[PDB]
């Protein structure tokens, strides 16, 4: 109240938030599928004893051969050009910003974590992922200080403002919003990390190629468990899942670290994403292949005995990734010639938008 | 304003909003009005464009309210090109 | 199951506050902004980890690393073993902010969600961040602590979770994290003074540091709680005896390493022999609040309302009798590995 | 069992547990049933060593379950030094 504009503001989210949009009936749906979730779902979770580590990846602290291990690291770090490291510093915050992702699918009526240690198929999942993912985190971490590439301190701070900033991925407590968000955002990252290991093998870091890849093949076993999930929703209720899904690409996945801030850029986000988007990693064309993926994956074109307005919501879903695409393709023949920018990431050093 | 423009205005504007036939065009109808969303401005722009052999640009694209406010910008790039 | 984590052994209660209750606090919101946001370090002006490590970007990092080894050389494994439970209690953060996230009249309703509470919750967690990835690295760059067996032990942690016994009442909350972020200010007051005397002043300052930290988040939920007693003396006291009563349990209590089944046990009584942590402090810890709420000199409580609060005062001289006794009839301690530190042996 | 010891067993009891002595308490009378915490039982034995000056290791504190069982064992320690 009574307020100005503040010297250090991070970006706020820009719409009035809308909570519990979901019917409180349909929480019941969830406890019955308490047991399916462990029989269906829970599978997908590797067994910790048989993770990998960020320390599998990263060179040896506790044998001799520490030194060099290192010292090679940097070697080959330094003939990755800034541009990629942008990209991957992006990532890094991301993954770095974990606690949000496990409080926003706490969030979620029916199957939120009621306790923190809730015995609950959907609670053992959330805590059991959130596990997987703090390794992503702690090993680029690990490895973007190593290489020295990096304004380490610069990296700590975008990541305190996004953390402090949170997200809204506008999911409004529904399990139904907030699982087609997670489908979709969790195969984002496949198709991400995919293009940056494949990116890095050619650079020829055939280390830091396995460390991306790796993260990849986490990512789609969380892919899996998601469109499952949802899959069983559409098998339940075909209605509320549509209009849901529906309701989420005309909202658009809005990504989850998108009010990233470093004291210095207003819009780091987009000029992060731009430079993504120039390199390949992830591109407007994806988002389209994303949002395909699922259509195909849970049937949506072969639903029957939708509502008046659940059909309108039907159609718009499986007629968007063309429509995307095409405007996709105009964008690029009317788009200007990119300018150069600094990035307090990589010391001010500047790369191509 | 010439009566060949705004003939075929008409076909994509109800082509692509899904509208038949049957509901009444004239030539100050606004996009608002026929019900469409902010995607639809441009993917109504977007076929004209094949269907005319003109590219507008972005910048007088947004300009745009009714059917005659576009049908007369495609006058104009038509008189420079043909 | 062969690998099993150990998991909390008791029903779990929930939503124990009364629902009327909850407006209390979006009646404080306007109170939490001017009170309790203050609190918080402004990001521009917050310490990073990077400026206590060894700078990668500069040509000293090769000797800066080298002295960070050197030094580490000297520090005996039975601290290492009680630096690593922090860096391993710190890093499951997640589980805090989701805990903090059940709090009926407070949780973040949308994970940016604009109210005081989930500013703070949100801020709050930003600030912790750094305690993990600071001694995370550092514990890295030592080289003294097999890294897999740490790592593996913090995703059987963040598998695991928590229970605090807070049952969704900010009330049990807020003096639970009153409580337990006090502990790990003097927890790493001590470690902070103790690696100083093993000559690592650049880790000393490390410990020194968060400790710093601690405080201030310490005198932002003392506050809050200071709020309910005078608000609702009656509750806040008879919460504040249950969760004595249960007994404040460790937030990292359910530490698993897949070796060690109670792997917590082991290493609280080595912060317990170092005297980093023991049970003398739990009763001062007590007691201040205690002294810092005025809960001596609260008047006007219901029938169990002073039976909760006569019981509540008399705590940390009772705690603190029991604990000389434990100590006297004490059994010589065994020596034990820790996969941590490579199934090197230190003293319970 | 010998009722002197009881009756400082008794006793102690109540000024821990902060009875009056028209509260009954017999031989057979239980720890919990008396209204005490699993601290109020390790207190009154702490108590009872300071009285009587000889001291209980924990390994036989558990089989605690009455005044009697308590009583018994304070004659068998007393039996050890005296
Ligand atoms: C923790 As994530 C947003 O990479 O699925
Ligand atoms: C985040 As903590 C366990 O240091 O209060
Ligand atoms: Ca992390
Ligand atoms: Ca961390
Ligand atoms: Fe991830
Ligand atoms: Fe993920
Ligand atoms: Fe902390
Ligand atoms: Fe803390």
């Not at chain 1, 949009?21 to 047991?35: A, G, R, T, Y």
């Not at chain 1, 690990?142 to 990096?150: A, E, H, P, Q, T």
């Not at chain 1, 969790?186 to 020829?204: D, L, P, V, Y």
Request: proline share 5%.
């Amino acid at each position: 109240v009574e307020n100005l504009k503040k010297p250090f503001m991070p970006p706020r989210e820009v719409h009035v938030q809308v909570t519990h949009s979901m019917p409180p009936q349909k929480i019941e749906i969830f406890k019955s599928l308490d047991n399916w979730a462990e029989e269906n779902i829970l599978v997908h979770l590797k067994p910790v004893e048989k993770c990998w580590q960020p320390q599998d990846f990263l060179p040896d602290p506790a044998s001799d051969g520490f030194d060099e291990q290192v010292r090679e690291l940097r070697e080959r770090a330094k003939e990755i050009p800034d541009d990629y490291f942008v990209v991957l510093v992006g990532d890094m915050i991301t993954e770095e910003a974990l606690p949000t992702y496990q409080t926003m699918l706490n969030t979620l009526d029916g199957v939120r974590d009621e306790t923190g240690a809730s015995p609950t198929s959907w609670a053992i999942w959330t805590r059991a992922w959130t596990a997987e993912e703090n390794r992503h985190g702690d090993l680029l971490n690990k490895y973007l200080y190593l290489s020295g590439r990096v304004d380490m301190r610069q990296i700590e701070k975008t990541i305190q403002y996004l953390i402090g900033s949170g997200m809204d991925p506008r999911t409004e407590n529904s399990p139904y919003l907030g699982f087609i968000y997670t489908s979709f955002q969790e195969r984002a990252t496949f198709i991400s990390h995919g293009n940056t290991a494949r990116q890095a093998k050619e650079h020829g870091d055939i280390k830091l190629a396995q460390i991306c890849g790796t993260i990849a093949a986490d990512e789609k076993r969380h892919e899996t468990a998601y469109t499952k999930i949802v899959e069983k929703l559409f098998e339940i209720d075909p209605d509320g899942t549509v209009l849901a899904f529906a309701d989420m690409m005309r909202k658009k996945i809005s990504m989850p670290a998108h009010l990233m801030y470093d004291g210095r850029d207003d819009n780091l986000f987009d000029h992060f994403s731009a430079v993504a988007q120039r390199l390949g990693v992830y591109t407007a064309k994806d988002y389209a292949d994303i949002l395909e993926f699922l259509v195909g994956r849970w049937k949506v074109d072969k639903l029957t005995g939708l509502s008046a307005e659940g059909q309108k919501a039907q159609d718009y879903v499986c007629r968007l990734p063309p429509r995307i695409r095409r405007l996709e393709e105009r964008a690029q023949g009317r788009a200007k010639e990119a300018p150069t920018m600094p990035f307090s990431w990589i010391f001010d050093r500047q790369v191509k938008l | 304003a010439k009566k060949e423009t705004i003939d075929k205005v008409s076909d994509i504007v109800k082509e692509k909003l899904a509208l038949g036939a049957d509901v009444v065009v004239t030539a100050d109808s606004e996009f608002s009005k026929l019900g469409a969303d902010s995607l639809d401005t441009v993917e109504i722009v977007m076929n004209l464009e094949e269907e005319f052999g003109i590219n507008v640009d972005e910048d007088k694209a947004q300009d745009i309210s009714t059917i005659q406010q576009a049908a007369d910008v495609i006058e104009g790039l038509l008189e420079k090109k043909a």
